[PDB]
Amino acid sequence: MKVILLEPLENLGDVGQVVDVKPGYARNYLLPRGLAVLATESNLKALEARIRAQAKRLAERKAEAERLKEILENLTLTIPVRAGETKIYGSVTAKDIAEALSRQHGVTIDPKRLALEKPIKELGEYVLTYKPHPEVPIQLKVSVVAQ
């Protein structure tokens, strides 16, 4: 008997996968514990539609990122800060870079998404990765300058 798993299951298969079990097992265990469903046509359709729908929203995100690589990776973020010689008085935070990025350049971003461990404390040219999606990592070149 073919069923569709509703969960990962010890040496049987993975969720959404279609396996063949003895009808007793399906009827008297798997189905009553909500662990699986009959591989009927009427719910094979549905599984197909779920795989369909997930894959729509995955590649749709992997575009919303990729297209956001286009808006960044083609600019430099220039941040004027009060500083002497090369060391800054205050600092440039991620929360700053994000607030900077909207004001000029237009793009709105999430500070927390940006890969900045400790607030930048020296003037110069920085190359900072964004990660708005795993597998789609972005290069934000940021020039921190004086005045």
For another protein, the binding residues (CB under 8 A) are 27, 31-32, 38, 40, 42-43
CA 105, CA 99: separation in Å to the nearest integer?
11
- In this structure, are strands 36-38 and 18-20 parallel, antiparallel, or unpaired? unpaired
Select 8 or 32, whichever has its Cβ closest to another protein: 32
Q: What is the DSSP code string of 3-28?
A: EEESS-BTTTB-TT-EEE--HHHIII
Structure tokens at 54: 């997930």
Consecutive H or E run containing 128: strand 124-129
Burial class (CB in 10 A: 0-12, 13-18, 19+), 102: exposed
Structure tokens at 119: 């607030």
The least distance separating another protein from the CB of residue 79, rounded to whole angstroms, comes to 58
By CB under 7 A, residue 106 contacts RNA: no
- Out of another protein, RNA, none, which partner does residue 31 contact, by CB within 5 to 8 A per kind? another protein
- Out of RNA, another protein, none, which partner does residue 43 contact, by CB within 5 to 8 A per kind? another protein
Which sign does the torsion angle of CA 96, 99, 101, 103 carry?
negative
Select 45 or 61, whichever has its Cβ closest to RNA: 45
- Binding mask 11-40 vs RNA (x if CB under 7 A, - otherwise)? x---------xxxxx-xxx--x--------
The least distance separating another protein from the CB of residue 51, rounded to whole angstroms, comes to 20
The residues that touch RNA, with contacts defined as CB under 7 A, are: 11, 21-25, 27-29, 32
